[PDB]
Amino acid sequence: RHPNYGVLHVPFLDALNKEALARGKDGVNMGAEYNLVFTKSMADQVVDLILDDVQKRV
């Protein structure tokens, strides 16, 4: 596990933590799980149906 030479590498999630905190958003969770239920596809489908209705009965 010897650290590399040249310029010591920074873990990508550490870099993202610093970047996100620089912009005021919350830092990396490192413990959050996935949304197994109610997936992105389901959310998009709901948006699709309401968009279809609103456009139809504009």
DSSP string, 13-33: HHHHHHHHHHTTS----SS--
Contact residues toward another protein (CB under 8 A) are 3-8, 10, 12, 14-16, 18-19
The DSSP output letter for 57 is T
Closest approach of another protein to the CB of residue 11, in Å:
9
Least distance between another protein and beta carbon 8 (Å): 5
58/56 Cα distance (integer angstroms): 6
Query: And the tokens for 43?
Result: 């959310």
| Residue (13 or 50) nearer to another protein, CB | 13
Q: How far is the CB of 24 from another protein (least distance, A)?
A: 17
